[PDB]
RNA sequence: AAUCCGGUUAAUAUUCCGGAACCAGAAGGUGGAAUCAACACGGCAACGUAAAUGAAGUUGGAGACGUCGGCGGGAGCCCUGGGAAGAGUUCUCUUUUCUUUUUAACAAACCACACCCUGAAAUCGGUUUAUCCGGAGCUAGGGUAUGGUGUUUGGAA
């Protein structure tokens, strides 16, 4: 003070974020500026990155392969860990590309 | 209204093509996750083998085992069929919550497996348990 | 030839008995290439960091034959 | 309209005689004209070889046994009518 | 720079296929290449099959089973629409013969 | 000719769908009452539609003309292989 | 079925030398995968995944195919703007004239006419150089497949 922002027994609500799909996983960046929200149902916009300082939401992925199960932030670097159904993909966000892909050998992560 | 919970149908698209399924519950209105007229079905992935007067109870039971599957299928990919299969054990056990919950998906699959065991052993829906030759 | 992007993979393949020799190649851009001659493939690891370079070089097993540029 | 009389047989120039080019003109127009498919209704039937008429319509792809230059001949149509008459009286 | 055939076969034929390369020694050279592979055709409609590469016949033997097949009935033999027509036609004609059996048994 | 007239009145008064997939939806939902199938329709498609109709207790009429004639009888400038009549309105084609 | 580059002799090289691969066959071994719900899961689907038993029999595909015409893509070549090394020219003129500026097989990752999904189209639209296409589902939207003589890296400086 993509996804739209909107600004009760002590209901001190600050900023409601509405997304097209039911979000399944939530993750926080170390600096508290980025929120990662993932939904497995959607595809094109399965995961959304929300910048609180800019008060905006965006989809950092042009084309997503596989349904996204969960997401988290790297604890030493801005890399985003995307746990899809079968793979785990490492994405570098500052340069917007794919670093590594982990072959879990798992039918469902 | 030819697709109702308890109607036998055929799948023509996907991995389980040519398999006979029973409509567990119809979502003709559609859903946010499936924006079409889909319906959850339970089918027979591996049909039981034919049995004879001979062979011991061990071999007959070994050949009578059935492997089921559960799947959300589009109406356009389902082929409706006049035969109907109903049992109270398979009413309302499946839902969207079951598909999201994988342990419930496996539990429902095992329940469908068992239910097909008593049904096959009792000799009901012999056509449904007979594989279709195409 | 095969490219290895993981240092511990390079050590593991070096530990494997099929490893025969190793080459350290120092390029003009201060990037080192650790190459490992196996029975079937020349496994190459491109280390752009100096400090990771020599800790890896001392990490290599003493029995393995390591050779200068 | 570029040619007045020869039409498709303008590719033959001045050769082979006017009458022979005339007879070829009737047959070549029949041989190359597109025909309505009796199975899919599309105007997609074309001649692959003399007597073979194949439809390029998507999903139909039917191949036909027919006349050399036209899909159906008068003799075939006349006898199909008689054969239908004979089977009905039998 | 002009090039020569690397083999003793003159006469560019369907098996004497060549390609121009620049070698690390700054030489223009031919590389002799094989004929292109073929995606398997469908058994009913004859169209190429979807999900399978274009290899030479002996070259298919080096792929794993899933790379040469599609996880469906007749996968790697028939197209999806061909399989669907097989399924519907089988079921409908079986229904027809059941009805005719009912009609003629009485 | 009378069937053509009833069809023409139906498309001005009642409700309909023109085409294979719209036909299947109406048969599936059970809202379809009568089913027009062109003479030149694929034999597999006709039998599948007839099976659909007898599941959903809908009447079937095998239009004598081909899909071009059926489209012309519909008054539209494309050939139509199959249509479904949900309501005839002023027309009495259902009976 | 499957081999590339550089080097080497007085005379041999895809054959020798150095380096780097590849094919077929064979045996068991190691690691992983399936299996007491015997012979794996996911995707509405096209189909995907590192695996994922299949005898006799039958069937299908590939191998495997004319000729001509333009169109589009790639590679090499040609051409070209700067930089850098030498060399030619220089009464005069010419920030120039010329030469050298290279990257193989192989290995990995990456990459959109057919097909699928929703949706139902006439005030008919889409569209090629070339008029074909659509209620047998156009346009549009989102997907799947095909995938190097392409890009990025290893080879490899």
UniProtKB/Swiss-Prot annotation, chain B:
Gene3D superfamilies (alphabetical): 2.30.30.770
One GO CC term, this protein: preribosome
Cross-referenced InterPro entries: KOW, Ribosomal_eL27, Ribosomal_eL27_CS, Ribosomal_eL27_KOW, Ribosomal_eL27_sf, Translation_prot_SH3-like_sf
GO molecular function, one term: structural constituent of ribosome
Keyword match Membrane: no
Chief subcellular location: cytoplasm
Superkingdom, taxonomy of origin: Eukaryota
Record's keyword annotation contains Cell membrane: no
Entries under PROSITE patterns matching the protein: RIBOSOMAL_L27E (PS01107)
GO biological process, one term: cytoplasmic translation
Entry's localization field: Cytoplasm; Nucleus
Alphabetic keyword roster: Cytoplasm, Nucleus, Ribonucleoprotein, Ribosomal protein
Biological role: Component of the ribosome, a large ribonucleoprotein complex responsible for the synthesis of proteins in the cell. The small ribosomal subunit (SSU) binds messenger RNAs (mRNAs) and translates the encoded message by selecting cognate aminoacyl-transfer RNA (tRNA) molecules. The large subunit (LSU) contains the ribosomal catalytic site termed the peptidyl transferase center (PTC), which catalyzes the formation of peptide bonds, thereby polymerizing the amino acids delivered by tRNAs into a polypeptide chain.
PANTHER family in the cross-refs: 60S RIBOSOMAL PROTEIN L27
Protein family (similarity comment): Belongs to the eukaryotic ribosomal protein eL27 family.
Oligomeric form and interacting partners: Component of the large ribosomal subunit (LSU). Mature yeast ribosomes consist of a small (40S) and a large (60S) subunit. The 40S small subunit contains 1 molecule of ribosomal RNA (18S rRNA) and at least 33 different proteins. The large 60S subunit contains 3 rRNA molecules (25S, 5.8S and 5S rRNA) and at least 46 different proteins.
From Swiss-Prot, chain C:
Annotated localization: Cytoplasm
Record keywords: Cytoplasm, Ribonucleoprotein, Ribosomal protein
Predominant location category: cytoplasm
Regions that span the bilayer: none
Residues of the signal peptide: none
Domain of life: Eukaryota
Keyword Oxidoreductase: no
Gene Ontology cellular component list: cytosol; cytosolic large ribosomal subunit; preribosome
Quaternary organization: Component of the large ribosomal subunit (LSU). Mature yeast ribosomes consist of a small (40S) and a large (60S) subunit. The 40S small subunit contains 1 molecule of ribosomal RNA (18S rRNA) and at least 33 different proteins. The large 60S subunit contains 3 rRNA molecules (25S, 5.8S and 5S rRNA) and at least 46 different proteins.
Function: Component of the ribosome, a large ribonucleoprotein complex responsible for the synthesis of proteins in the cell. The small ribosomal subunit (SSU) binds messenger RNAs (mRNAs) and translates the encoded message by selecting cognate aminoacyl-transfer RNA (tRNA) molecules. The large subunit (LSU) contains the ribosomal catalytic site termed the peptidyl transferase center (PTC), which catalyzes the formation of peptide bonds, thereby polymerizing the amino acids delivered by tRNAs into a polypeptide chain.
Name of this protein: Large ribosomal subunit protein eL38A
Species assigned in the record: Schizosaccharomyces pombe (strain 972 / ATCC 24843) (Fission yeast)
UniProtKB/Swiss-Prot annotation, chain E:
Misc. remarks from the entry: There are 2 genes for eL34 in S.pombe.
The encoding gene: rpl3401
Entry GO CC: cytosol; cytosolic large ribosomal subunit; preribosome
The protein's name: Large ribosomal subunit protein eL34A
Chief location category: cytoplasm
Family matches, as Pfam families: Ribosomal_L34e
Similarity comment: family membership: Belongs to the eukaryotic ribosomal protein eL34 family.
Assembly: Component of the large ribosomal subunit (LSU). Mature yeast ribosomes consist of a small (40S) and a large (60S) subunit. The 40S small subunit contains 1 molecule of ribosomal RNA (18S rRNA) and at least 33 different proteins. The large 60S subunit contains 3 rRNA molecules (25S, 5.8S and 5S rRNA) and at least 46 different proteins.
Entry GO MF terms: structural constituent of ribosome
Organism placement in taxonomy: Eukaryota, Fungi, Dikarya, Ascomycota, Taphrinomycotina
GO BP of this protein: cytoplasmic translation; ribosome biogenesis
The keyword Ribosomal protein is annotated on this UniProt entry: yes
Top-level taxon: Eukaryota
UniProtKB/Swiss-Prot annotation, chain F:
One annotated Gene Ontology cellular component of this protein: preribosome
Coiled coil: none
Domain of life where this protein originates: Eukaryota
Entry's Gene Ontology BP terms: cytoplasmic translation; rRNA processing
Keywords assigned by UniProt, alphabetized: Cytoplasm, Ribonucleoprotein, Ribosomal protein
Family: Belongs to the eukaryotic ribosomal protein eL30 family.
Note: There are 2 genes for eL30 in S.pombe.
Subunit record text: Component of the large ribosomal subunit (LSU). Mature yeast ribosomes consist of a small (40S) and a large (60S) subunit. The 40S small subunit contains 1 molecule of ribosomal RNA (18S rRNA) and at least 33 different proteins. The large 60S subunit contains 3 rRNA molecules (25S, 5.8S and 5S rRNA) and at least 46 different proteins.
Record function comment: Component of the ribosome, a large ribonucleoprotein complex responsible for the synthesis of proteins in the cell. The small ribosomal subunit (SSU) binds messenger RNAs (mRNAs) and translates the encoded message by selecting cognate aminoacyl-transfer RNA (tRNA) molecules. The large subunit (LSU) contains the ribosomal catalytic site termed the peptidyl transferase center (PTC), which catalyzes the formation of peptide bonds, thereby polymerizing the amino acids delivered by tRNAs into a polypeptide chain.
Protein name: Large ribosomal subunit protein eL30B
Gene: rpl3002
Residues represented out of the complete protein: 22 to 116 of 117
